[PDB]
Amino acid sequence: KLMDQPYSKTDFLMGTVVTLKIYDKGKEDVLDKGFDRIKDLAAKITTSDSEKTSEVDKINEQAGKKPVKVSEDVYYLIQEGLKYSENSGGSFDITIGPLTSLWHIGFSDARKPSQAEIDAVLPLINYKDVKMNDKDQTVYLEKEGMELDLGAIAKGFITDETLKVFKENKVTTSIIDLGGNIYVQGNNPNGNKWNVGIQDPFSPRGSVIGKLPESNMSIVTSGIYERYLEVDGKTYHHILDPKTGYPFDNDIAGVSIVSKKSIDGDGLSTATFSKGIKGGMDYIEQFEGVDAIFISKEKKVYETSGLKGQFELTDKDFQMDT
Numbered sequence: 001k002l003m004d005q006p007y008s009k010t011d012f013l014m015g016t017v018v019t020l021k022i023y024d025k026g027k028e029d030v031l032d033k034g035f036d037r038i039k040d041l042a043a044k045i046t047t048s049d050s051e052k053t054s055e056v057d058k059i060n061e062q063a064g065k066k067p068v069k070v071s072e073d074v075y076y077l078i079q080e081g082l083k084y085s086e087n088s089g090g091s092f093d094i095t096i097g098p099l100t101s102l103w104h105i106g107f108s109d110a111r112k113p114s115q116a117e118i119d120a121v122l123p124l125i126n127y128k129d130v131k132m133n134d135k136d137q138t139v140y141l142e143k144e145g146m147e148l149d150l151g152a153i154a155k156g157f158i159t160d161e162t163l164k165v166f167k168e169n170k171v172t173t174s175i176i177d178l179g180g181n182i183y184v185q186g187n188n189p190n191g192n193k194w195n196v197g198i199q200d201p202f203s204p205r206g207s208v209i210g211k212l213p214e215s216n217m218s219i220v221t222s223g224i225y226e227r228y229l230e231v232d233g234k235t236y237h238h239i240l241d242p243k244t245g246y247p248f249d250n251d252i253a254g255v256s257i258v259s260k261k262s263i264d265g266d267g268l269s270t271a272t273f274s275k276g277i278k279g280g281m282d283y284i285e286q287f288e289g290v291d292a293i294f295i296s297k298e299k300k301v302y303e304t305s306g307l308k309g310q311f312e313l314t315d316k317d318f319q320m321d322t
């Protein structure tokens with residue numbers, strides 16, 4: 001019971017254009033259910049809440065005082081945030097809050113902080129300083145000044161929770177688009193795989209260099225010009241090195257991580273970005289079922305072993321290589 005033209009709703013949340021599309025005859029009401037679940041989770045987890053009413057806003061408030069009871073969503077997301085900090089090359093840390101709050105890249109008051117300000121917040125970054133109580137469902141930051149930032153895994157977790165709300169309503173065929181996070185469920189009604197736009201990391205969001213046939217997967221796109229600060233004609237993107245305080249700078253311009261779960265595409269993005277085109281390709285080769293497309297600063301495109309010869313390059317300004 002598939003339609004060719006889907007039920008579709010677009011909003012604009014978290015400063016990003018969100019679109020949900022369901023190709024299932026009769027399942028129109030599931031659009032408002034998906035969006036309700038996005039707005040409910042986004043309100044629980046955000047650290048950009050100017051009112052400071054979030055569950056994370058409260059943990060950050062009681063840093064070095066007392067633990068904070070949290071809902072299951074927040075407790076689960078933080079638990080996964082800590083695990084992704086273990087796997088990394090010391091590259092990923094949900095306690096990067098104080099550094100990300102200082103730069104505040106992509107906000108109206110985005111600035112390049114002085115070296116002295118950056119040196120002040122670095123020693124406060126340690127995921128091992130986050131103690132969770134299971135029997136209490138409390139999260140505690142052990143030292144004053146620590147802050148949580150879940151921005152790196154927030155959209156991935158939300159996309160997976162949107163996908164689960166979808167299948168509880170027996171949706172079979174859908175597209176979830178949360179800016180740089182895309183989930184394609186089932187197939188194009190016409191029977192072919194979904195054609196996923198692989199973002200041009202040198203153009204506004206939606207400009208693509210090529211399509212990638214996928215079905216039942218997440219594509220999480222990162223780029224050096226997605227949300228960036230330009231001070232004195234020098235660019236600073238949002239993926240920061242917790243051990244230096246500055247953005248990661250290598251040959252990578254864009255990466256799209258193809259995974260089963262969108263939270264994993266978000267979760268491995270930082271460590272993958274941190275290691276460079278070739279060091280990051282090898283990092284992806286250690287994850288079964290995870291693959292990636294890298295786009296170098298010289299506009300050369302690289303596939304991981306599981307995606308070789310599958311990506312269809314359609315911008316002639318870009319070339320394929322090994």
Ligand SMILES: Nc1ncnc2c1ncn2[C@@H]1O[C@H](COP(=O)(O)O)[C@@H](O)[C@H]1O
Nearest residue numbers: 091092093094096100151152238239240
């Ligand atoms: N090294 C990091 N570890 C954890 N979270 C980070 C890190 N760098 C940036 N973030 C947060 O995650 C966002 C970038 O995630 P993404 O666009 O998925 O690469 C930033 O806006 C910060 O809120």
Ligand SMILES: [Mg+2]
Nearest residue numbers: 152153266269
């Ligand atoms: Mg991320």
